[PDB]
Amino acid sequence: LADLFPGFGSEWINTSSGRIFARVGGDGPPLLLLHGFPQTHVMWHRVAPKLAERFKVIVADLPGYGWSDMPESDEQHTPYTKRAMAKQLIEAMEQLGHVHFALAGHDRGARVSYRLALDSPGRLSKLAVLDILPTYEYWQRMNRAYALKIYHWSFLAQPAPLPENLLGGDPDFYVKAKLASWTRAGDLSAFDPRAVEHYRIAFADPMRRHVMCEDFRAGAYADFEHDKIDVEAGNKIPVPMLALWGASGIAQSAATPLDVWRKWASDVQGAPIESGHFLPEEAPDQTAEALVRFFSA
Amino acid sequence: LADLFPGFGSEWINTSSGRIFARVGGDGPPLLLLHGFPQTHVMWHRVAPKLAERFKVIVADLPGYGWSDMPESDEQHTPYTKRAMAKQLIEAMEQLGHVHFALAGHDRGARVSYRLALDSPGRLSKLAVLDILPTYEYWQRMNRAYALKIYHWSFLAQPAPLPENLLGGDPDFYVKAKLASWTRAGDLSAFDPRAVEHYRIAFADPMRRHVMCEDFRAGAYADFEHDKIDVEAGNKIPVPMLALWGASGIAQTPLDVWRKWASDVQGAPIESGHFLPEEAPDQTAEALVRFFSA
């Protein structure tokens, strides 16, 4: 597997929930980057160099993803809830001496990030979320059109072992079909082939695939309930926030994303980028510039 | 494969879209029975004898299912739309000289049946639908809870080859898990093992699975649009109608829904999961005999 982060170190960070793998580079204010599904930390490889010119960059695998340890799940999918993942990554950052840091997340990692901001806002100087709306908003918007568009939210959340057994026959085809499907072009041309191989090797492990399904089970149940409590209480994220989304990504599908985030956050700016879902790989120059600009002064 | 219809004949009925397989038994007024997903005509094996005491019973494999021929699909999934399936089954019944008959359907076959009643009500003396609401109603109800409960309506409707590819690895597991998960018991104990083997053998064929996906693609697209026209026009089924549903089933307030779609409908729950004719054959048969007898 290729080293896609020239000059970055590698840490396996201990936490009570298991080790977090991360690439670490740069110098300056600390910035944590969190990937999503069906990816790993390597999705940041096209923007991490520019960010490392200005920040100490920590590029972490989510709990249970990539090279991070895989805690055993439970009947409530607890370790793969965004609340639990956020607690685990807070512990991981504390091992590095970071108790107040900047955070950018994409896809599932962006759900960890806004959940972190809701539960522990004092941990974050600034927050960026890439190509998402809150989990509560995706579910509240489910109707026939969106059930067809994001079918995988309901498919991968079916009780085990149904998705695991369907994914086991030809895992390469599914992970590559999802990667292609959510790009603007509908193929794999936006990805570095070495990055695709990282994603494919991770997805080829049945234990890794089970974690992904637990993530989506949490997304259908506890994560939704945690969000529901906040929205029904009127709780807003106070951390200065940036919402970026792809003009051809998932979040915009049937929702105007900045209006949605303004319901959830009291100091939020947002912009579209010409891109499908995978902003840091499909639009690395625009994504890196937006993030550098936001996190700087 | 076991013969689960003692005394019934076996017939391949010609139509302009391909052959319809059916088991045929009994004498009296004609009654067509239509199965659904992921089953074949054999799901009627526990109630067909009692019906054949009073009716000529025709137990047909849906277009593309079981032993029926598989017409070539197209970009709009036309032959697996319920409108097209109903036309094809109307042709098959004409080959037998039945132009006015009783009809009972379950699951996909009940969707064929109510669409047949809307398009061609003169064909039907009486209609029974088992453990369904109209396809439009399912989709209008498609919130988080329902997207999780009937996920396969969106999964199997994904563009080819996504579900076809996933189903090929372990088809026996998928068909068995569907059969079990929709019953009251949650396992396969309500089914005759010989019936399960019929369903497994059909589902083992990739061409048969592709048909099923085309059926759910039609269900997400053309079938929904056809139903939407009738709702938007205020069109109701005039055929006297029975809606039966499982107290633990999928359709679960169903008589209230059907009264919006039908001007003469009665209904009742059966203590059963989705698969009424196999989980509760005695109550299902009694309800059907009483309804169709008049």
Cis peptide before A38 (omega within 30 of 0): yes
Tokens of A25: 């580079």
Phi/psi at A58 (nearest 5 deg)? -115, 115
CA-to-CA distance for B4 and B8, rounded, in angstroms? 9
CA-to-CA distance for A215 and A66, rounded, in angstroms? 14
Chain A positions touching B155 (Cβ under 8 A) are 151, 154-155
B147: which DSSP letter? H
Tokens of A20: 């977090």
Instruction: Compute, in degrees rounded to 10, the torsion defined by CA atoms A130, A131, A136, A140.
Output: 160
CA–CA–CA angle A281, A286, A288 (5° rounding): 75
Phi/psi at B246 (nearest 5 deg)? -85, 135
Distances (CA, A) of B128 to A10, A289, B38, B236: 66, 63, 20, 15
Q: Do B169 and A174 touch (CB under 8 A)?
A: no
User: In a 3-state reduction of DSSP, which class is residue B111?
Assistant: helix
Partners of A289 in beta bridges: none
Phi/psi at A252 (nearest 5 deg)? -75, -10
> At a CB cut-off of 8 Å and minimum separation 6, what does A111 contact?
A36, A82, A105, A132, A134, A135, A219, A223
> At a CB cut-off of 8 Å and minimum separation 6, what does A236 contact?
A263, A264, A265, A266
CA-to-CA distance for B57 and A155, rounded, in angstroms? 38
Kindly report the number of other CB atoms within 10 A of residue A269's CB atom: 16
CA-to-CA distance for B198 and B178, rounded, in angstroms? 14
Encoded amino acid at B277, one letter: P
Which pairing describes strands B265-270 and B241-246: parallel, antiparallel, or unpaired?
Answer: parallel
Experimental method: X-ray
Chain A positions touching B153 (Cβ under 8 A) are 147
Distances (CA, A) of B233 to B221, B236, B254, B261: 19, 9, 21, 11
Kindly report the number of other CB atoms within 10 A of residue B275's CB atom: 27
Question: Which chain A residues touch B if contact means CB-CB below 8 Å?
Answer: 139-140, 142-144, 147-148, 151, 153-155, 157-158, 162, 165-170, 173-174, 177, 220, 224
**B80 burial type by CB count under 10 A (0-12 exposed, 13-18 middle, 19+ buried):** buried
User: In a 3-state reduction of DSSP, which class is residue B98?
Assistant: coil
CA distance A171 to chain B (A): 9
Q: Are B65 and B43 in contact (CB under 8 A)?
A: no
Partners of B58 in beta bridges: B24, B32
Enter the resolution in angstroms: 1.5
> At a CB cut-off of 8 Å and minimum separation 6, what does A289 contact?
A50
Phi/psi at B118 (nearest 5 deg)? -75, -40
Radius of gyration, CA atoms only, chain B: 17
CA-to-CA distance for B88 and B94, rounded, in angstroms? 10
CA-to-CA distance for B41 and B67, rounded, in angstroms? 9
- The residue count of chain B comes to 294
* Chain center to CA of A6: 22
| Sheet arrangement for strand B20-26 | B9-13, B20-26, B56-60, B30-34, B101-106, B124-130, B241-246, B265-270
Question: Within chain B, how many helices (H) and strands (E) appear?
Answer: 14, 8
* Chain center to CA of B52: 19
Measure the N-to-C terminal CA separation of chain B; round to a whole number of Å.
Answer: 36
Listing DSSP states for A46-100 in one string gives TTHHHHHTTSEEEEEPPTTSTTS------TT-GGGSHHHHHHHHHHHHHHTT-SS
Chain A positions touching B148 (Cβ under 8 A) are 154, 157-158, 220
Q: Which residue of A has its CA nearest to B171?
A: A166
Buried b (16+ CB within 10 A) or exposed e, A99-131: eebbbbbbbbbbbbbbbbbbeeeebbebbbbbb
Q: Report, as residue numbers or ranges, the catalytic residues of A.
A: 107, 277
CA-to-CA distance for A89 and A96, rounded, in angstroms? 11
Domains of chain B: 1-294 (3.40.50.1820)
Residue B243's nearest CA partner among B276, B266, B277, B271 is B266
Q: Are A122 and A236 in contact (CB under 8 A)?
A: no
Phi/psi at B32 (nearest 5 deg)? -100, 130
Q: Do B169 and A173 touch (CB under 8 A)?
A: no
